[model samples]
Target: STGSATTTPIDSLDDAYITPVQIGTPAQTLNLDFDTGSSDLWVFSSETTASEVDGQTIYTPSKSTTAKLLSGATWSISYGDGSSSSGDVYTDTVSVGGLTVTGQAVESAKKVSSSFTEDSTIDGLLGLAFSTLNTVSPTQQKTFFDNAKASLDSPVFTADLGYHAPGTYNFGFIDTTAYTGSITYTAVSTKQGFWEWTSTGYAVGSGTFKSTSIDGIADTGTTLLYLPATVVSAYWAQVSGAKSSSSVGGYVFPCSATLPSFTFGVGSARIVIPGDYIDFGPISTGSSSCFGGIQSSAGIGINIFGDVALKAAFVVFNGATTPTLGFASK
Candidate 1:
């Protein structure tokens, strides 16, 4: 629900973050994570055995002379953050630099766990944002927009999410004369891969609460933003009895009052969360409002619109037709 807002955090590719996908064919050169929370594209093969790929960072298509795999099928992804993996469907002739787009559909986990096979830097998660959040495929598998949706000129995709700060997160469909239009979709919850979505209301500081229509699930690897508890006390009551101070895991909140600029709507697509992300990056003894950027998961089945809602918005991940999720802006 409520969606749109994020532009100022990217940390690489000179600030565009970098998202040039399209894999398979002898293709599978990697570097992803432009994640709109979830969708699948992990990598780590040659039989995956370093102890089920510990700590991850595995995508060694023989060093990518241009990789490929996918023989029959078996990709298993289960993430709303509980984390899970089982891999087998392959085809990673995936490259993304010289602009060569081909086959691409990867996930060779074979059983991953080091937190989704961690070697970190970036080798897994190209989920621009929703194939029901591809938890191991079969929600009608469209693995990366059904292979770049016919060489991508513009059915489009563009994220450029920013987190480590500085800026580095970009998806395809660019330069539409300085782009800014089209980005809305929500459907997935045939059961798993959650995202049935509903958040057409709630705000703080400028006030907006009465539960506005409530009904939610819009996860993105859910690192934060888990609302409930009367809409997080109606956004911390804008700073009155405001609470939370466990140290940073709760999600940095330290409000006395300065917050305003809240939003959450999905049907009409309003999503605008920015109280400076509830005063982020302030850690000395503890000052991010004890990190209460929104919590209290009332029965917490899954209602995530996190990564602070894709750092604001510009995500596109239409697993090519069936499974969908999109958002826009340069």
Candidate 2:
């Protein structure tokens, strides 16, 4: 069987993306960040601290007849940005866009970081990365996709993230109409439980392509694109008045400066990210200096191809026994 869900950007900067998910027997729908960077289907629930409960929806297992506690099981996770959450575990009937998965492990948040509490746009996160990254204790839990893979018509999922508009996530099948041009396939290394791959090279705007191998992970949970310092410097150099400021925490440029587009290679195919995407918007309200969407990975250790890059093309997370990633221009 196949299913699809619409994912919408949470803010003007496309800070994050969220999709509606149904949890429990009677089905409590909550908007969850569909994160490809981590593995653990966690949610804000009745178990969460009262002070941490803001405007976000909470899942009450008591309301679901099918809810079952996963005794002795617990989960905790932290993101690269320092945001974190932890809670006990429960199994219940969960569904996404009509795709049902019974007995799905649902981590009920008992504690959450201030960042999560302040963000009223998302109720929780639904991790789509490999199950190896699951933080559950006592017993590792499979991701929703992994658990539903066998019943799917095909073991695959696609991410079509948009800049400011709503996009789609398709399960078990690729929507031919969702993209144009032939897809370019590449080997994926799931060793770190991420959709890690190497890009053949990159180009700054309409310049010549650099023939270098850049390894990175496709992380939908992250807000920006992070590449090698050298590459980021090259891109910023083309923009007038751009500077790497320690006080600002990243590369920032005059809000009025024209930015150059970035292009990266996937095998023989090249996907170009429009300059507008790299503009990223101002660092502060009414500020003349704007933050860049692409930053140096020097401190990050690993390069991240986050929403800034994912929004440029259609991405396929193929889960066949021999896993592979497919990229197509949209």
Candidate 3:
């Protein structure tokens, strides 16, 4: 039951990646963000307030004969960025690419925050995280991938995220052609519903690598890479005109500023993110001011390896055994 899906970068926002998914029986196609950070496959639905929804497509369960309401079920989820959504629950058929999972919990949004409502193009979210992170009340929910894996040949998926470019999420099998060199394996702990791992060490620019364990999460939903506060401060110091801006709440540098490569240790292998990738395009179009793709992960206590860091590698999420992470250069 191996399958794959093409992921497209969101226009203008280039911050998140979206994949097409069909929900319900007749199947309402919606562009959803494949997130590894959280576990809640929620969508804009007919139950949502018209004033709360913008340009997002709605999933009307009433139209689908296969849709079944989960009695007394409800769900509410909040993001690290403070965005949130709450809704009623239904079990329906969900398809990603050619892979389909039936009778899976699908949360339909009845209330959405400004952040989600404003993102008109993103119609929903497909959580790839562990089912333990699900937010449904009375009974927990399982994600599409969680239910689909039972039929999959191998409980594995690969994320090949490219910089400002299209990528593919290969399900149930690893695509050797998408990466180079050997894949580096790392053990992951998921008590908190995230693909959490600890780095053996790291280095700023071309500097010497230090031996410090950095615990972090691989969050595809997040846009930038977040590290320790001290590490972030040290990295920005190398940028000539880079400074911490209260308005930005992060490091801001001139568009012309040259950045250094960031290398992190995964077991014995070192995955280096190039300097050009460090500059996450620009903060605003036609402006010389640019935002550093690497920021401080102070609030979370743990670090986050977001899209900025992920684009530099081919990542394999293994659910077959002990929930391991395999990485390689793309």
Candidate 4:
């Protein structure tokens, strides 16, 4: 069995990506952030505080005959950005595209942070990380991918994130037409419950490749690409008016500056990120200074190849027994 879904960027900056998910018996569809960094299928639901509910849609389990309370189970999660949510649990029929999983654990949000309340475009998150990272208490539950993998024609799912247009997520099989050339495979470590891998090295626009190992996670949830301070500084230094401003909270450069492309190695294959992707956008409306999409990971504790990097190529989250990641140019 196989399935496919379309993921669309939430805003012009491509801050996050969301996909439609069908929940409950009658199919209450909601747009959820398909996050690869966390593991927990949570949603804004009828159980959520009314005051916290704004323009987002809510899932009402009461309307579904297939819904059943996961008695004594509870979940709470906090993100690196300080936003958080906590709720009770329910088991119901959840479907993405044409793929369906019965008795899938669907967390019902009871409390949510202000940031989540303000983001009207996102109803909740559907995590794709390992189930070991699930925040459920008493008994953990498998993610949708984990639950559906056995029945899939192949134990794999692919991410084809776009720059500004809509991309696709394919399950059970790889879409040959989505990429070009041969895929470059690399070992993945699920130690931290992330799609973590190592890059061979990197180079600043048209420069010689630096032969070094940089370990990072391919996180679809995060908005920017974070690398070592040395790498970030080297790239920014090439820009004429770029500077690390404490007041602005990161590297900012003149909007008109000609930015250089960034290239990173995956084994012997090199993936180049266009310069325009690095120029995130203006710091404020009508501002002349633009914020950078690539920043230093020193403060983050770990490097992250987020949307900024992933959008440049086709990504495969292979779910074989000994999982591996595959990257291909698109």
Candidate 5:
């Protein structure tokens, strides 16, 4: 049987799409941010400091009959955004979109950073990356998807993310009706524990597609698109009144600045991002200054085709032999 669930945008922040997942036996439900950039399923729990978990639901292991303590195991994670959590481990049943994984490793937070404390709504993160990226030491942990893959009709999951709209994450089967046009498949490199792929260059507006190759990864956890410094500059060059500033971070352009459409090539297929979409709204309310959604990836090493770019197409994360990614218009 296949599994599917809707990914709803939180507070219209455009920062992420959170979904619900059930954990423990008797099922304690929690709203989790499904992240593909990292691998570790952790949540705010009874063990967490009381002040750190306000407005958040906590998972209480003692309340579940099936919960088993992994005595010496512990986990600590720090996100790119500087949010962090450290916790002990427990084995429990975890279910997502109707698919269940028994004896799944569930990290229950004992301590959390300010970033997480301030974001009162998000209870935790459910990692979708490969199991090799799991943070548990001595014995690594498997993610909900990894544990469920074996029984699936096909070891694959598709992300159908759209702005201010309902999107679905489907497992074990591809719903052709969810996407339009043909799906373009590309081989992925998971050496860095990511759904990494190479772009066969790109172009601004109607310019010729360059042959310069760019290495990047599809990251659902990230909000904006990130490219090489040169690329960020090249794209913005097409726009008037655009400049990079440390005070504002990355590049900023006039809200009225008309940007040229950008395109990234995968094999012969072109994934085009409309110029209007690249403007990630204004930096402040009623301000003429706007942040360019596409910025330099120098700080992060490799380029990131985050939500801004991924939402422009329907994405398939195929875990079959020689894992590949399929992209198509949504």
Candidate 6:
């Protein structure tokens, strides 16, 4: 009863850098990122400090007459990437693809850092991640999914990316014409205040992990896939014509080589992570051994399978249906 999910991340502050999603009449272009760690969808604003907004995105309230700010609801957020924003929340009309979700909560910042203010590659983030991951005390009515629930044009939420390969990111419904494969939904399990759960096990192709491992968490906030050093080292060992090299935080592999396939399971659903994503880009260390797949996290709070894992398939975080992660090809 579930479908594909599209979760994308923006690099710059320009709304044009992301998908050319039009708001009305395909006129206004708004860039958005689907983040699960934080729920609020905000862009750079006029009130935001210019000095703080280097390398981050800034929203233009004047440019958007339809965009609104919260009445009295003040907003502030701190990110793992060492960025922070404190501002007010407002209501506005934001759109994705050709679909528009009106009365959406938009945050207007008064103070911000470069990470939160100046990312010039992408414009704003379309936060379908979760309502709970909201950075500040939000009084917004509904999240991307929450507001779209009542619309008929909406159905299964799917994220189809051409990443690993280029593709489409759709919401409410996944455009099936682009992909043909099995689409499965895994129930969502809310552990703490965090929207997360553990995978029952893992599998490479048809082979499951010998021992049960707490499958990595699925987070859109994080930018990279973080796994256990032991598992990463072991994985590199199996690569074809593999060699030894100094690893960056433990991502092992040669500077140049074809990557292997690694798959993992959640309940009965499985996700395949391709070789290109596994081996991150190479480093300056003169060793052929470099990293591709998994690496160590800055700390133990979360070992996430970021875009590297997300690009491989559609992840159905249907906590409303059940506490599991549904996996299917995009």
Q: Rank the candidates by TM-score, best first.
A: 2, 4, 3, 5, 6, 1
For each candidate, give its TM-score against the true structure: 0.32, 0.99, 0.97, 0.98, 0.95, 0.78
Off by over 4 Å in 3: 284-286
* Candidate 1 whole-model C-alpha lDDT, 0 to 1: 0.53
For model 4, what is the alpha-carbon lDDT of residue 8?
A: 99
- Number of clashing pairs per prediction, in order: 59, 0, 0, 0, 0, 55
Query: Candidates' lDDT values, in order?
Result: 0.53, 0.94, 0.89, 0.94, 0.86, 0.57
Model 4: per-residue Cα lDDT over 1-330, one tens digit each: 998999999999899999999999899999999988999999999999999999999999999999999999999999867899999999999999899999999999999999999999999999998999999999999999999999999999999999988999988999999999989999999999999999999999999999899999989989899999999999999999999989998899999998899998999998989998888889999999999988999888999999999999899999999999999989
Error of 6 at 319 (Å): 6.3
- Runs off by more than 4 Å, candidate 1: 1-34, 37-40, 44-46, 53-102, 105-113, 117-124, 127-147, 151-154, 157-202, 205-219, 222-234, 237-242, 251-269, 272-330
Q: List the residue pairs that clash in candidate 3.
A: none
Superposed by TM-score, candidate 2 places the C-alpha of residue 92 at a distance from the truth, in angstroms, of: 1.0
Off by over 4 Å in 5: none
Judged by whole-model lDDT over C-alpha atoms, candidate 5 comes out at 0.86
Instruction: Identify the superior model by TM-score, candidate 3 or candidate 4.
Output: 4
RMSD of each: 16.1, 0.7, 1.3, 0.8, 1.6, 4.7
The TM-score obtained by model 1 is: 0.32
lDDT of 4 at 274: 91
